[PDB]
Design a protein around this ligand. Structure first.
Ligand SMILES: Cc1onc(O)c1C[C@H](N)C(=O)O
Ligand SMILES: Cc1onc(O)c1C[C@H](N)C(=O)O
Lengths: 258, 259
C-alpha cells in the first residue's frame, strides 16, 4: 500500500545517524533501538515506511499560549505522520489525543549529576539553592513535577518554575552538556534509560544518583481512528513475548568505556 | 445505572476474605489491592459494581480440546462479566479476544524454592532431575514455557509437559504448599509479585532465586466492544500518575518484618 510516515526523534541510542550517513538514502541513514523496532514492527504488520525526524525536535505537549500540540504528538494529531516510534512516554494527557500500544520499554525519572557533586537524592536537591537543576521543556518529566502532591517534588517544582535563568532545556543533549560544563552547579532530571546509557560512555563524567522517581513506559503511538492501532499493539506484544524487545535493549545498552 | 459485574479471583493480597467475612454482605466481604483498585476505578468512571469470584478459579486459557476460554478471560468473552480486576497478565493471545488497560503493575516470571534447596537459576533446574518443578495451569506462565524458543526454557518445557506425577497446579496457594511439603524436592514457577509477598511472611521457609525470566504487566480487562474500555484505560493512567497505585502497592506489600 502507501508508504507509511513514521515520526521519530534524534535521541541516542534510540535514533542516531550512522557513521558516513551521507552515503545512505532515507531510512538507511539511521540506526538505533527504535530504528530496529520500526523494522521489526513493519515486518510483522506488513507495511512500507519512511522515517521522518520531527521538525521541531520535541516530544509533545500543548503550546502554553495557543494550546496547539507540538512535537511528535502534534505530527500525529494533525495528520503529518501515521505512527510515532520513539522514546515517547505513555501519559494520560497524551492518551487523550492519540493511542499508545502496550509499553515496549520501562523507565523512570532519574537524577543526573557530574561526578563529585554533593548530591545523593531529590531531597538533597530540594534542600539547597547552590546547585541548580531542571528538566526538558514540554514533556512528561516537567509535567510530573508540576502535577505532584509529594512534598519534595512540590518543593522542586516551586523552585524550577521560577528559576533564573531558565532551568528547562529544549533537548536532553542540551541538559547533559549543561551538567558537564557547570562544574557541579547543575543537575539534570531525565529518564533512567538515557541517564544509564550516558553514564557508561566517555567522557565518563556523569552518573545517576539514587533510584527512579517513578515507574512507567514508552509506547508506539498512532492517530485516533487509525487502522494500524490493533496491528501495532499486537506486534509489540509479539516482540515482547519472543524476547526481541529484551534482545534490542541488551544490544543498544551494552556496556566498558567507563 | 446498572450494577456492573466485576470478575476477579481469590489471590492474596489482591483479593482476600476479611476477618469474620460471614459478618459482611456482598463487596464488603473482601479486601485487598484489587478490591481497592475496583473501588477507585468505579469512582472515576461513575459506576456501581458487584464483585463476583470466578467460578472455576482460573486466570484463563483456551482449552486445547474444546477451544473454549476458561477462567476470568472466559467470563468476559462469553458475557458473564464486564470487567476483570485481578493480577491478570497482559498477553498476545488474550489481547486477541479481550481488551486490556495500560498496565497497573509490573512483574516477571520467577523461581520459588524451599530454603535449603540447591537451586539458584533456571539453568540449575534444567541441568538436573532430582528436584521437580511446575507452574499454574491455565494461565500465562504455562504458555510462556510452551512457546519459548530459548534453549533453557525449551528444555524445562519438555520435562514439565510429561512429568509424573503432574507438576501443574490449580492455584498459587497449592503450588506454595507443594514447595513446603516436598521438603525441597519441588520448585514452583510463579510471578515475582506473589513470590516476593510470600517470601516475607511466616512460616518464612520459601524464597525467590535468580532474576525474573521476563518483564510484563497486569491490566484491567473488558470484553471486545465494551463502552467501558476507554474510561477504564484513562482511569488506570490517572490513578498511576496520581500516585494511587504506588500507595496501594506499598500498603498491601508492606513488610512488617515477620521474617
Ligand atoms: C527521552 C527522555 O528522557 N528524559 C525525558 O524527559 C525524555 C522525554 C520523555 N520520554 C517524553 O516523552 O516527554
Ligand atoms: C497471579 C499469578 O502468579 N503466577 C502466575 O502464573 C499467575 C497467573 C498469571 N498472572 C496469569 O494471568 O495467568
Amino acid at each position: 500500500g502507501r508508504t507509511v510516515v513514521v515520526t521519530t526523534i534524534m535521541e541516542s541510542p534510540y535514533v542516531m545517524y550512522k557513521k558516513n550517513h551521507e552515503m545512505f538514502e532515507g531510512n538507511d541513514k539511521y540506526e538505533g533501538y527504535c530504528v530496529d523496532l520500526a523494522s521489526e514492527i513493519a515486518k510483522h504488520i506488513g507495511i512500507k515506511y519512511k522515517i521522518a525526524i520531527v521538525p521541531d525536535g520535541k516530544y509533545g505537549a500543548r503550546d502554553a499560549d495557543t494550546k496547539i500540540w507540538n512535537g511528535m504528538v502534534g505530527e500525529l494529531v494533525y495528520g503529518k505522520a501515521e505512527i510515532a516510534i520513539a522514546p515517547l512516554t505513555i501519559t494520560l494527557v497524551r492518551e487523550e489525543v492519540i493511542d499508545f500500544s502496550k509499553p515496549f520499554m520501562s523507565l523512570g525519572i532519574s537524577i543526573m549529576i557530574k561526578k563529585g557533586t554533593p548530591i545523593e537524592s531529590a531531597e538533597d536537591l530540594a534542600k539547597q539553592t547552590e546547585i541548580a537543576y531542571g528538566t526538558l521543556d514540554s514533556g512528561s518529566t516537567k509535567e510530573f513535577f508540576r502535577r505532584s502532591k509529594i512534598a519534595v517534588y512540590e518543593k522542586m517544582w516551586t523552585y524550577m518554575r521560577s528559576a533564573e535563568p531558565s532551568v528547562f532545556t529544549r533537548t536532553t543533549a542540551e541538559g547533559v552538556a549543561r551538567v558537564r560544563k557547570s562544574k557541579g552547579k547543575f543537575a539534570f532530571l531525565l529518564e533512567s534509560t538515557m541517564n544509564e546509557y550516558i553514564e557508561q560512555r566517555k567522557p565518563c563524567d556523569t552518573m545517576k544518583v539514587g533510584g527512579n522517581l517513578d515507574s512507567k513506559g514508552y509506547g508506539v503511538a498512532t492517530p485516533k481512528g487509525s487502522s494500524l492501532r490493533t496491528p501495532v499493539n499486537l506486534a509489540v506484544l509479539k516482540l515482547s513475548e519472543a524476547g526481541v524487545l529484551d534482545k534490542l535493549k541488551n544490544k543498544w545498552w551494552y556496556d566498558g568505556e567507563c
